[model samples]
Target: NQIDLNVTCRYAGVFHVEKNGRYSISRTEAADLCQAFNSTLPTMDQMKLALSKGFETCRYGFIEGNVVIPRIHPNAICAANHTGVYILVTSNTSHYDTYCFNASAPPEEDCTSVTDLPNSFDGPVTITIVNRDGTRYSKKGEYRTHQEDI
Candidate 1:
């Protein structure tokens, strides 16, 4: 007798994080820090663990059209006029990716808007995401405070 199983691959969802300079850690130093805390930083297996832990999963970009669906951490939060951070999940086991948004310097808006959000009191910011394709997606940008805080 023979048995067969079929599987489909797709993005699980994306998670969001605020670029709080204090909480935000850099990839270059995250691993060491995790070890110090006796906690393992996110890896492919860790990301999978996050997915299994009831984290919200969704695709990138607008909700109307999604190119990739990544499993988002349940503790994730949405931003309003403030930058956020997130981890992307994909079937590609080779690597993972991370994304960051600055509400003060939104890519969708013009820079002339002086009323735009201001950078977080913290200094430079670093955002990191691990992709399944064995690629590290990282970006450094200014942090911005949410409007409500202002």
Candidate 2:
């Protein structure tokens, strides 16, 4: 499911760092990796959102969103004076970890909220069902309960 939640702060690692601490990298070099996850390097605004989401970083990571100009401190551990703050220093010589963004899209929810009581209950209940084609089946009688509501 594409749906992402603040569940655990809605953040995670993609797979690997864009580069190890060997050489300071470029935004274009970083952008080359984007299609791998359908993501960008993240901008100051995107970094802002990441900070709130659980992406607060420790080491410096490239921000391709700004042409790799803005380098952000990874998390509280790295931020001695500032948390979620981009270091004034952006580099092509210093070696540091690069943060990337990937997750997108959301779950498909076609219907509104409804009480799905059990068939064992004495009270009558109405249920609505939908198909992939957008066809909906509504019934006033008891049928098999949805496993989701179980």
Best by lDDT: 2
Q: What is the C-alpha lDDT of each candidate?
A: 0.28, 0.38
TM agreement with the true structure for every prediction:
0.26, 0.43
Model 1, residue 89: C-alpha shift (Å): 11
Instruction: List clash counts for every candidate, in order.
Output: 25, 5
Local accuracy of candidate 2 as per-residue lDDT tens digits, 1-150: 111000111243221232323334444444433333355565566556555544443344566533222214433445444655455454356433444555552222112321221222222444343332344444454321333322
Model 1, total clashes = 25
Q: Return the TM-score for candidate 1, rounded to 2 decimals.
A: 0.26
Q: What is the lDDT of residue 87 in candidate 1?
A: 35
Best by TM-score: 2
Report residue 11 deviation for candidate 2 (angstroms): 2.3
